[PDB]
Structures are given as structure tokens and as C-alpha cells.
RNA sequence: UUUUUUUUUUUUUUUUUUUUUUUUUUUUUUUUUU
């Protein structure tokens, strides 16, 4: 009973249609737990990133001897929403399929062929949760791997869509996620190529192709001020040290 | 605390607490201020600089105007800004075409109004939406600007920080638009700017004489909200419904899910003030008060309630505490000729008496009653302080003259009939070529495939003679009929149906106003239709001699009429000429005519007869119920005839909507719009058989519907024929009412139809008066793979919720008609004073019911006037049977049931009686 | 072969005695099918890339390749996959590509418009079947009388 | 013109299910063409 998308072309926000949400992060914030970490900040997203190694592995049967082996474990907090979580995420199948899916994006872009015989430790907390989760833990795990020095071809950007009626939406928040479908994307580099594209509720067949275009859009800015933030930080750490 | 991100645009933080059902939550929420707010002026000349396309890539567009309304000294050239309260009970003069020209409403205004009452926010909307070049109303989003928004100060209400805002808004546009002298008026009925509250700037408008009574105007107190939540959830509070009747206003009924009975409530006292069909709040009365301070207590006492309901003559009583919903609209009344006070040219207080007779009488002030004193008004209720004793209204719109045939527009209101015009938005959707609108000579032309991607799936069956008959009034046309002989002896026919779903497109603003109305409306002299002129009278209705789009059925039916081939498809078609019933009965008739076409037309009517034989087969029940059709023209109350033609097309219908149902069914087995008739109780016939059986000594069987259209064909009466019909039409007003459905509510059995023994029904052969049979064309386009189906037609939700809505609004349209029927029956028999005659259907221990059967209006006769010395009546119900003496000349005389007398009619001061 | 069971199953009619159930015996009063609003079938594609890492990251040209269906001796080698859910509305039920391979936008458009007419001929196999199978079943229990 | 051959390391799998939750209601007679 909301006006979602008023005649005049406003979000409930006071956001437009083609609009981000601010766009806060931090580099090196944990430099006494681990080799890389990342603070991102989307809307009113919260997240650490922790990243350890290359490393010894703990034991001798989780070695490669022509590649490394990575890992991924997301931490979902009982704090995280305005209701209290009754139980644990901890051993939820959403969870195992979010960390499956994060670990086979990541495979393809890491040169992982350079660092046999070693391990990558990704460690996630989510600490405040307000819509398109998902995009902001791929922007998280980029930031804090190009922080650790790893090897890698490209960036990798997370982005949200949603379709309300006619109207595309871009970068939903938890109201309109509870109103529409939406669509994930993650976009390599500054081409056209999908890494990720997740769907779960319905959506027309003759409607996609204009939400994939305004996500890849949407998803090449964020690289933009991703890049940006780095390029500013090692200017400061290179300037003086 | 804000920061700048970007282009000019910032960031907050909005927190508050959200109270539900007991517990407590913080809310936390983002807020972004701008800078391209444009002012929608068209006198400015630096807005246009700063907007931006929206989605669809369109530019905003600037409504209000450079040259507004000019007051006098010292203001000048106003606009006017609308506050929270003045929209909320004053939205009568702002819809008044009279005033209010120039309006604008801030966001905090809008968000409240829509807070406290949605309707009142939609009309609100509607008003924003529906601009033009006599009234402008536009929507400043004041919270989202960065030059008008304000941050609440510590230990200060809701309240102030919304005033605050408000004025802030009206300074920013009396800067803003200085330069092109144009002031600002800040209107609200609480306590630089141009402050006035709502009965000042009234006396400043050059026709404040003509507007100025439209202004708006011991019971104990009602419980407070929490407390009334806490009672209800606790289980001491209960909600229902309340009803009362005309004869006795100091007594009520409420029917609660507990209780087996209604709960009575008695006293004028324990009554607050209620009126008819609202939502209340009730609570239980002690034993020692029931019709002959804790919660423990008060279940037990609802406890002893539920145990005394059953066997014990006691009926538990309650009171009202709180009013849920109120009915509340707009009423139609005459003014009382009793309140008024001659001389008297001051303001003064009057009474209104409505046209509802189960609602209160309401105080009106004005100071132009001498005017009224003959004319219907429209009014609406404010408020009933527990003081008064009546509630207080406010005038709103003069209808006309008492009696006089326009006025008379009410019956419209009261029966919640729409009849205004269509908006500019609905018009949009129509096509813009109009009345040139031509299918294509050829349906493979580049052109003519390239603008209809589906063109390659529509047939061409322009190659057959295709008659049409309708009645002499009749413009819009539905349906068409062919006929022609097949080599091998089978008879081929094919109906054609008009497809109005090819220029109608859910999610259109032409959709949304079709399905508001539920049915098209019709009158004797008048019409109000469901769809646009120039679509269904011009664009859609299959005119004869021009192309035409349509949806065309074809079976294969032998000479026994046996269904072995049935096909649907879109096609095109061209019909040749177009007939009505007696011209096709002089068509047929007429000898020396030999084309093939009236062998086509002989034919069908043969082929109907064979069908219509199966039905009766089947089920007999055949009715002939006069409409009491009315034509005078006075520079003559005839009866309806059913003929040859009528029977024709009937069966070609029946057998169309039978097959669609069939065909709906197969292809959507959870939402397929279908039609039902549960078969109904006995108490309405058993009376009936009773007093039949006691005089005229017949019986009607219950066995099933081959045996009651048997029993009803056995009553014969060789004097009188019309009996037969009125026993006819006496067991007309027995059956349940037919109702629409989805095919996912009910099982398979329920779907049958009792008035026509058919297992499954539907309705698809008048799109264009009915949506029931667009929503039918659009599920059987969609069952054919010929194009997917929408969204709301596959969701039960929204198929209930259009159930429901035609469902009341064809039970509307049908009293609609048959009040305005018997209005002008009245009026026709007013004017003219003579004899005529009636049938006793009725017979009362102190009155007789008498029905005129050239009229068709029932008439009762009190005993009081009907017998003098009442006391000497006498009257049995073995024989039904009353005995008095008449007035005119003293002898003992009887009456009985189906007799004959003379009625006449009077005129009405506050019907029909003995002449 | 969930969709096909859900379709064909029917449970034991019921009637309700006051507080308690009753349940009839099969042998006794018909038993009853489920109702389905609609039918959901899956289709899954393979990806191999023809090139190293570098071209199909950095390149102009998009060479990858795309099969259906694949087999036990492809899947062992492929480098991303994708699933589609469609029904005979034209709607998209859900999408899945978890990592993998990158791939042009274009491309998975693509693919998704192949999959629709594989599903509507799925649709009127699995009906048509259903409807013999109801009438070999009528048929014995009409010459069974 | 004799004479001139240099090349590193490793062994046999972490333990306990599918439920993975937010913005507010109503009212008394079949069928077809109108």
C-alpha cells in the first residue's frame, strides 16, 4: 500500500530509479589478524573480511601439489536483522550453497596454479544486513584479496536488480526485496562476461535482457569506486613509507 | 549529522518505535535529501533547468498556472497550501468545481491523510491526477528537498515538527516565487505567511454565498484503542456487525463467531451512536439485566452466556463500547418542512430526513432554506457528539426538483451506480486512428503482419453470409450466425463473438475502469455502459458491410444436433446485414424470397428447436415473467412477447458458453471463471405447498428439476391461464441466488447449475457489457496457446476479489433497474387516475397483498382502513380466510387468495390502495 | 519424476465426526488427487572453453561452446554449468550459475530462449501419458465389472 | 696443438538433517438479447 515508485519518480528512500546507495569502504583496518582484510560499508551493510595465507596446510591430506586450495566460511550473527535469529546459520543449507558458490567464482579469477602446496583462508562477518547481501560479500572478498597481494586477472563486482511491475530498480533495499523479485550479477572486469547470475523468484522471460544490461551498468561503477579507494590508499601508503 | 556524497545529494537517518501487539522495535532507515525538486509552475524560468527523465524517459511536466486567481488588497494572485486537518474532513470543497483552482500539497500532508484514512488519501490522489485546464492540484515532496526539510528538536511532538515543516514549505515557495508577484495563502483551522483559516479565506472568494454552507460542521464515552485491544485479544471483547431495522430503533443485533445466536442489545443508552451495517465492539451485560470488573469474571460470565443459549429462555444482552468502521458516505435527503423558520433571514438549523429509512435523522445548517423546500440534496454526516441526540452534516450538491424525472440521478446514488464521465487517462489507451480504424484487405501484407506480430495466426473466414439480429434499440452488437449444407448432409454453424479483449489490456487505466463497473446498466430511457463509446458502440461492435475482428466457434452438428466436431479461432470476418426479431420473423415468413440465406436462417431455427427439445429433455424449467415494459411518450403498459428468433440464438449461446466452460476447464483446472446455482432450501416452497394445497389444492415435487418443472406444468387452470405464471413467478422468489466462482474453490460436484440441469457453466458471449466474459475471452485466448495469460488470472487471491466485486455489482444493477422501472410505473399511473384491476397473492390476518397483473407493483390494504370497527375482523389460517364488513355498504363478505378486485391509486404525502 | 508423481498420487477421501477424523478405506469411496498450479521442469547446460584463461578474460572474440544435456564422460570435463526452471507460461522459475566459467550475457539469453521449447514438448509428453494411463486404468476396471 | 663428461628433496580422507517467519476487514429473488 506504499508508493514504491511515486508518479514523480521517487523511491521511498528518496532515491531514483538509477541510483547507487552510499558506498563506504576500508583497506587494512585488521593488520595484526590477518595477511588481508577489507570493512565494507553498502547502505547500512556491515561486513569484515579476513584473509589468511598462503599458508601450511593443517593436514597433510588437504594438499595439492599443482594448485592451492581455498576456502570460504561466511558468519551470519543473530544481531544481524531488527529481529533476534532464534538459532544458529551456522549449518543451514543456504549458507554451505553461498560459501559453494563464492568458492567457485573465485577459482577461475585467482592464479591459484603459483601456490602449490598452500592454502587460502576466507573468513566472513556479517554484521548488520539490509538487502543485496550477496553483492556486497563478492565486492568484500575482492578488496581484501587485492589487499593480501594474491595474484588475480580482474576485478569482480556485485550488483542487485529489481523489477517492479515495469520499472527496473537498482541496488534494493530490505523494504523493496520484500516487494519485488531480484536479480544477482557479478561482472568481470569491464566487460559483459557473468561470473555470477542468480534468479529465485519468478520473472518474465521477455524481461531480463533489459535488467541484465542496467546491472552490468550499475556493476561497472561500482568497480569504478573500488578502484578509486585503492588507488587512493596506496598513494597515501607509497607517499610517505 | 549529514554527508554529502556525490552531485548535491545527502544522507540522514530516520529511527523510531514501532508498537505492535505488545512489543517494542526500533526502526532504522536511510533518508536522502536532493536538489532537482522542481516548483511545477509554469511561470518559472529556472526549474526547467534542473529536471531529469524518469524511467520511462519522461520529462516532468509543470501544471499550475502563470495567471491564478486574483483576490482583493492586499494579497493578490494566490496559490493556496492545504494542512493535514482541512484535507481530512474538508475534501468536499476541494473536489467542488467552484473553488480551490490552485493547490498544493506537501509530502508530510499526503503521508498522514493516507495514515489515518486511505480512502480519503485516494480521492486525494485521484485529484492530483485528474488535471486539466479547470482545477490543478500537484504533490511537493518537501522531505526529500535539502532547502524545506527540518530536524526535530529535542522534547517537542510530532505535531510541531509537522507545523514547523509546513511553514517552512510556504516560505521557501513565497521567496521562491516573488519576482513573478504571486503570494502564497497557508489554510488550516488551528493556531511572513499569509495565514487564514478555512471560514476566512471562504469569505474572501467573490461567490462566498454560493459555498458557504458546504463548510463542515449523554452517551458515555467510548474505551480507549489500547483498551480495546487488550479486551479483544484477552478474549472479554468481541466484533461483529450490528443491524437494525426501521420498525425499532431502540434495539440491535450483533453475531459473533462464538456464539450460536445474535446477541441483543437493548436501550437507547446501551446503543451509542451507531448506525446501520457498522463495525462494533460489544461486551457482555450481568444475568441481572439479560432479556426475559475482571477478566476471570467475565469469562465466566461469557461461559454462562454460551451454556444459557441453548435451552434456556434468557437471552444474554451487551452493549457497545467502540465503533470500528463506519458506512458513512455520501446520502441523498429532502429537507423537513417542519424546522424552518419563515421569518427568520439569519443562519438557522434544520433537519434532513433520508431516503434510508434504518438511519437517524441529521442537523443542517444553512440559511437558504426557503429555496430547498421542495428538492432532493446530497449531504454527508461530520461527527455525533454525546451530547446531541442527532449527528451533524453539511451541505454538499443540489440534485434538482422533488418528483421531476431527472432528480429522480438519486436512485443512482443509493443504489452506488458510477455515472460520470470517462477521463482523458482512459481515453489515451484508445486507438489513435478512431473511427478510420479498418482491418487490412489481406492478412499476409508486410505492413499489416509487421503491426500485429500474431496476425500470421488469425484466419480469414470473410467468405460466409453472416446475419445478426437485435433489438430496434439496440447498437452494440455480440453476436452473429451463419448456416450452410455440407456435401455429406451435416449441418455446420459457427457463432460469432465479438473480441473486445484485443483492445483491452490489463494493466491500462481503460482495464481498471472497465472492471470497476461490474455490468453495464440499462434503462428504458437512458443507459450507462461499461466500456467507452467509441470502442464498443463504433470500434468493436460487428457492424454489417464492414470488416470486423471477432472470435468464432464452429461445431459440426448433424440433423439430430449431435456434437462431433467443436473448434475455436480468432478470425476475421465481414457481416452482410444485420435484423431484428419480428423483421427476421417476416423475413423468414415471407415466401417469395428464395436465396439461400433464409434456408441458412430456417435451418438454425430448426436446429435451436432440436436443442431446445434436449433441454426440456433435460430440464423444463421455462419461465415467461413479464418485465412491465413501459414506453408512453406523451406527445400504454405492454407486455414482452417471446418469439421464434428469441428461441434461436438463445441455444447457439448456451451451447458457446458450454463449450467454453469445458474448454476453460480442461486448460485451467484451479482458475477458471465459472457461474453456479446451488439447489435451494424447502421453507420458501413448503409454505407455498401448504397453501396451495389448502386452496387450490396442487403440489410441487422437490425430487429434482425434471420433476418441479413437471409439478409446476400440472397446475391448470382452464378459466384463467395466467395462473399458470403466477405460480411461475411465485416459485421465482424461492431458489438461492446464482453466484460467480473460481474452479479452484469448489470440487467438481458443486458445479452444477440447478436452473438449467448443466454440470458446468460459464459466461463468454457479451464481452462488451460484462467483464465476467472478458476475463472468459482472455482464459480461453490463453488456453489455445494463441498468446500467454496475465498475471491476475492466475493468483486465487485476485480472482476472489473480482468475484466479489461483480458479484455485487450485478446484484446492484439489478435493483438499479427495477427501481427505475417502477419508478416511472408510478409516475405513468399517478398522473392518469382510473381503474385497474388485480391478483390476491397474500392473505394477513389484518391486510390483504394484492398484485396488479398489468403492472406488475404489489399493493397491501390495512385492515384499519379496509374494515371499520377492526375489532369485528376474523380471520383463520385453516382456510386463509378473513371476514368483515365493508364501509361502503355493511354485509357480511370474505375473502380469499387469487381473487379478483379493483385498486386505484393516490398520491403520497408521509402506494397503492382499495378503490 | 517429481512433477510426474505429484501428478499422478491420490490420497484416501475424508469426512470430519465432530471432534475426530475419519478416514475411508480405498476400497470404499474413490480416493482424491492434489491439485498442481503448474508444471516446472529443469534444463541444464555445459560450457568448455577452447582457449586458455587469458583469451577468454582479455579477448575480443567469444569462442566459448554450450551443449545440452550432457553426459557422464562430458560433465567430467566442462568448466561451468547452468540450470533454467521455465513453464509453459513463459515465466523463469529460477537461474543458477554459481561461478564458473565467464560468460557473454548474450550467450545465457540465448540459452534460455533454447530451453522453452524443449519444456513444452516435456509438458505434452508427460500429459499425453498421463491421459493414456487413466484411460488403460478405466478400461480394466469397466471390463473388471 | 696435447689436455677438459657436468646432472637437488616428501607415501594409506576433521564426528551428528530437511521448519531456514513483518506495515491494518463487511451488508436479503432462475435464463437469453438489450
Redesign the interface.
Known amino acids: ?1 506504499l508508493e514504491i ?1 511515486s ?4 523511491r521511498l ?7 547507487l ?2 558506498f563506504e569502504s576500508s583497506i587494512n583496518t585488521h593488520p595484526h589478524a590477518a595477511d588481508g582484510s577489507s570493512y565494507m560499508e553498502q ?2 551493510n556491515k561486513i569484515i573480511t579476513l584473509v589468511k595465507g598462503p599458508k601450511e596446510p593443517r593436514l597433510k591430506s588437504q594438499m595439492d601439489t599443482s594448485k592451492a586450495l581455498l576456502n570460504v566460511s561466511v558468519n551470519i550473527t543473530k544481531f544481524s536483522k ?2 533476534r535469529s532464534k538459532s544458529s546459520h551456522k549449518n543451514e543449507r543456504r549458507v554451505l ?1 553461498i560459501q ?9 579469477n585467482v592464479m591459484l596454479n603459483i601456490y602449490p602446496r598452500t592454502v587460502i583462508d576466507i573468513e566472513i562477518h556479517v554484521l548488520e544486513q539490509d538487502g543485496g547481501i550477496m553483492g556486497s560479500l563478492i565486492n568484500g572478498i575482492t578488496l581484501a584479496l587485492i589487499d593480501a597481494g594474491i595474484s588475480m ?2 576485478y569482480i563486482s556485485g550488483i542487485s536488480v529489481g523489477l517492479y ?1 515495469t ?2 530498480l537498482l541496488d534494493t ?1 530490505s523494504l523493496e526485496e520484500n516487494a519485488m523479485s531480484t536479480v544477482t550479477l557479478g561482472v ?2 569491464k ?16 524481461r ?2 533489459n535488467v ?2 542496467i546491472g ?1 551498468a550499475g556493476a561497472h561503477r561500482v568497480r569504478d569506486l573500488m578502484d578509486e579507494e585503492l588507488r587512493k590508499h596506496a598513494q597515501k601508503r607509497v607517499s610517505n613509507a | 549529522r549529514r554527508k554529502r556524497l556525490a552531485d548535491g545529494l545527502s544522507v540522514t537517518q530516520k529511527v523510531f518505535v514501532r508498537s505492535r501487539n505488545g512489543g517494542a522495535t526500533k526502526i532504522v532507515r536511510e533518508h536522502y535529501l536532493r536538489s532537482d525538486i522542481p516548483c511545477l509552475s509554469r511561470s518559472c524560468t529556472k526549474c526547467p533547468q534542473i529536471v531529469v527523465p524518469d524511467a520511462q524517459n519522461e520529462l516532468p511536466k509543470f501544471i499550475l498556472s502563470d495567471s491564478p486567481l486574483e483576490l482583493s488588497a492586499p494579497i493578490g494572485k494566490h496559490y493556496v497550501v492545504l494542512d493535514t486537518n482541512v484535507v481530512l474532513q474538508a475534501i468536499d470543497l476541494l473536489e467542488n468545481p467552484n473553488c480551490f483552482f490552485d493547490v498544493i500539497v506537501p509530502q508530510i500532508v499526503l503521508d498522514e491523510v493516507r495514515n489515518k484514512s486511505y480512502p480519503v488519501y485516494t480521492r486525494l490522489r485521484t485529484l492530483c491526477r485528474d488535471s486539466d485546464d479547470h482545477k490543478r492540484f500537484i504533490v511537493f515532496h518537501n522531505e526529500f528537498s535539502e532547502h524545506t526539510f527540518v530536524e526535530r528538536l529535542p522534547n517537542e511532538t510530532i505535531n510541531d515538527r509537522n507545523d514547523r515543516a509546513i511553514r517552512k514549505t510556504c516560505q521557501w515557495y513565497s521567496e521562491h516565487l516573488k519576482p513573478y508577484d504571486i503570494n502564497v495563502v497557508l489554510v488550516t483551522n488551528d493556531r511572513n505567511i499569509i495565514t487564514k483559516s478555512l471560514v476566512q479565506y471562504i469569505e474572501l472568494l467573490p461567490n462566498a454565498d454560493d459555498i458557504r454552507d458546504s463548510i463542515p460542521q449523554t452517551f458515555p464515552e467510548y474505551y480507549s484503542t489500547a483498551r480495546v485491544m487488550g479486551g479483544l485479544k484477552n478474549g472479554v471483547l468481541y466484533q461483529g456487525n450490528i443491524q437494525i431495522s426501521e420498525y425499532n430503533f431502540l434495539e440491535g443485533s450483533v453475531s459473533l463467531p462464538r456464539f450460536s445466536k445474535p446477541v441483543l442489545i437493548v436501550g437507547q443508552k446501551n446503543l451509542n451512536r451507531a448506525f446501520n451495517g457498522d463495525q462494533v465492539i460489544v461486551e457482555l451485560l450481568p444475568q441481572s439485566e439479560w432479556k426475559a470488573i475482571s477478566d476471570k469474571q467475565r469469562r465466566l460470565l461469557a461461559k454462562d452466556a454460551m451454556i444459557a443459549q441453548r435451552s434456556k429462555k434468557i437471552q444474554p444482552t451487551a452493549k457497545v463500547v467502540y465503533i470500528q468502521r463506519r458506512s458513512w458516505r455520501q446520502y441523498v435527503g429532502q429537507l423537513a418542512p417542519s424546522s424552518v423558520d419563515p421569518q427568520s433571514s439569519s443562519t438557522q438549523n434544520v433537519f434532513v430526513i433520508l431516503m434510508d429509512k434504518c438511519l437517524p435523522k441529521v442537523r443542517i445548517r444553512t440559511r437558504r432554506a426557503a429555496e430547498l423546500l421542495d428538492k432532493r440534496i446530497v449531504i454527508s454526516i461530520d461527527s455525533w457528539p454525546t451530547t446531541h441526540k442527532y449527528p451533524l452534516g453539511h451541505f454538499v450538491r443540489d440534485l434538482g426538483t422533488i418528483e421531476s424525472a431527472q432528480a429522480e440521478e438519486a436512485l443512482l446514488l443509493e443504489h452506488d451506480v458510477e455515472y460520470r464521465p470517462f477521463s482523458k487517462k482512459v481515453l489515451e489507451c484508445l486507438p489513435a486512428e478512431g473511427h478510420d480504424w479498418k482491418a487490412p484487405t489481406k492478412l499476409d501484407d508486410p505492413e499489416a503482419v509487421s503491426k500485429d506480430p500474431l496476425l500470421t495466426k488469425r484466419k480469414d473466414l470473410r467468405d460466409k453470409l453472416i446475419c445478426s439480429i437485435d433489438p430496434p434499440g439496440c447498437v452494440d452488437i455480440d453476436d452473429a450466425l451463419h448456416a450452410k449444407k455440407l456435401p455429406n448432409g451435416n449441418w455446420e454453424v459457427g457463432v460469432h463473438i465479438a473480441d473486445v479483449t484485443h483492445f483491452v489490456k490489463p494493466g491500462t487505466a481503460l482495464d481498471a475502469e472497465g472492471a470497476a463497473r461490474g455490468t453495464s446498466v440499462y434503462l428504458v430511457d437512458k443507459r450507462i455502459d461499461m466500456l467507452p463509446m467509441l470502442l464498443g458502440t463504433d470500434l468493436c461492435s460487428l457492424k454489417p458491410y464492414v470488416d470486423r475482428f471477432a472470435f468464432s466457434v464452429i461445431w459440426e452438428l448433424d440433423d439430430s444436433a449431435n456434437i462431433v466436431n467443436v473448434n475455436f479461432m480468432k478470425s476475421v470476418i465481414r457481416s452482410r446485414e444485420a435484423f431484428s426479431y419480428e423483421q427476421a420473423q417476416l423475413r423468414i415468413d415471407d415466401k417469395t424470397q428464395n436465396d439461400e440465406l433464409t434456408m441458412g436462417m430456417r435451418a438454425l431455427l430448426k436446429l435451436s428447436v432440436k436443442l431446445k427439445q434436449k433441454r426440456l429433455e433435460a430440464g423444463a424449467l421455462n419461465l415467461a415473467s413479464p418485465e412491465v415494459k413501459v414506453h408512453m411518450d406523451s406527445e400504454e403498459v405492454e407486455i414482452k412477447k417471446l418469439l421464434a428468433t428469441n428461441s434461436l440464438v438463445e441455444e447457439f449461446m448456451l451451447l458457446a458458453n458450454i463449450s467454453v466452460a469445458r474448454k476453460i476447464y480442461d486448460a485451467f483446472p484451479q482458475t477458471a471463471m465459472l457461474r453456479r446455482h446451488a439447489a435451494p432450501p424447502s421453507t420458501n416452497f413448503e409454505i407455498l405447498n401448504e397453501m396451495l394445497n389448502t386452496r387450490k389444492n396442487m403440489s410441487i415435487s422437490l425430487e429434482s428439476s425434471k420433476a418441479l418443472a413437471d409439478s409446476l406444468d400440472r397446475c391448470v387452470d382452464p378459466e384463467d391461464p395466467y395462473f399458470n405464471t403466477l405460480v411461475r413467478i411465485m416459485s421465482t422468489r424461492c431458489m438461492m441466488a446464482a453466484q460467480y466462482f473460481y474452479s479452484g474453490a469448489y470440487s467438481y460436484p458443486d458445479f452444477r447449475h440447478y436452473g438449467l440441469a448443466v454440470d458446468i457453466y460459464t459466461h463468454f458471449t457479451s464481452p462488451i457489457r460484462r467483464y465476467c466474459d472478458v476475463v472468459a475471452h482472455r482464459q480461453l485466448a490463453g488456453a489455445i496457446g494463441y498468446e500467454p495469460l496475465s498475471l491476475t488470472h492466475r493468483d486465487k487471491n485476485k480472482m476472489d476479489m473480482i468475484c466479489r466485486n461483480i458479484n455485487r455489482k450485478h446484484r446492484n444493477a439489478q435493483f438499479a433497474g427495477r427501481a427505475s422501472i417502477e419508478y416511472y410505473v408510478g409516475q405513468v399511473m399517478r398522473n392518469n387516475e382510473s381503474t385497474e384491476t388485480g391478483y390476491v397473492i397474500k392473505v394477513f390476518n389484518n391486510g390483504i397483498v394484492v398484485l396488479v397483473p398489468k403492472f406488475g407493483v404489489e399493493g397491501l390494504i390495512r385492515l384499519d382502513n379496509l374494515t371499520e370497527d377492526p375489532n369485528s375482523a376474523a380471520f383463520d389460517e385453516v382456510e386463509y380466510k378473513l371476514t368483515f364488513v365493508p364501509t361502503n355498504s355493511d354485509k357480511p363478505r370474505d375473502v380469499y387468495v387469487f381473487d379478483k378486485v379493483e385498486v386505484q391509486v393516490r398520491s403520497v404525502m408521509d402506494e397503492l390502495l382499495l378503490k | 519424476a517429481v512433477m510426474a508423481g505429484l501428478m499422478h498420487f491420490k490420497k484416501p477421501d475424508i469426512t470430519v465426526h465432530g471432534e475426530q477424523i475419519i478416514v475411508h478405506p480405498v476400497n470404499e469411496r474413490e480416493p482424491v488427487p492434489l491439485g498442481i498450479l503448474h508444471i516446472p521442469i529443469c534444463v541444464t547446460f555445459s560450457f568448455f572453453n577452447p582457449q586458455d584463461t587469458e583469451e577468454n578474460i582479455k579477448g575480443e572474440t567469444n569462442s566459448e561452446i554450450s551443449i545440452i544435456d550432457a553426459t557422464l564422460k562430458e560433465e567430467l570435463l566442462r568448466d561451468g554449468v547452468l540450470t533454467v526452471t521455465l513453464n509453459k507460461n513463459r515465466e523463469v522459475v529460477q537461474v543458477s550459475k554459481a561461478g564458473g566459467l565467464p560468460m557473454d550475457a548474450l550467450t545465457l539469453m540465448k540459452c534460455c530462449h533454447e530451453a522453452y521449447s524443449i519444456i513444452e514438448k516435456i509438458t505434452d509428453q508427460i500429459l499425453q501419458l498421463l491421459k493414456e494411463d487413466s484411460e488403460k486404468r478405466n478400461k480394466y476396471a469397466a471390463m473388471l465389472t
Open positions: 500500500r515508485y508518479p514523480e519518480g521517487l528512500d528518496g532515491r531514483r530509479w538509477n541510483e546507495r552510499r547502505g547500512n531488527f529481529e550453497e559453494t558458490s563464492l568458492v567457485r567464482m573465485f577459482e577461475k586477472f580482474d511491475d520499472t527496473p533495499n568481470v572486469g566487460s559483459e562476461k557473468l561470473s555470477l547470475l542468480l534468479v529465485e523468484d519468478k520473472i518474465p522471460l521477455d531480463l535482457e541484465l544490461a552490468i
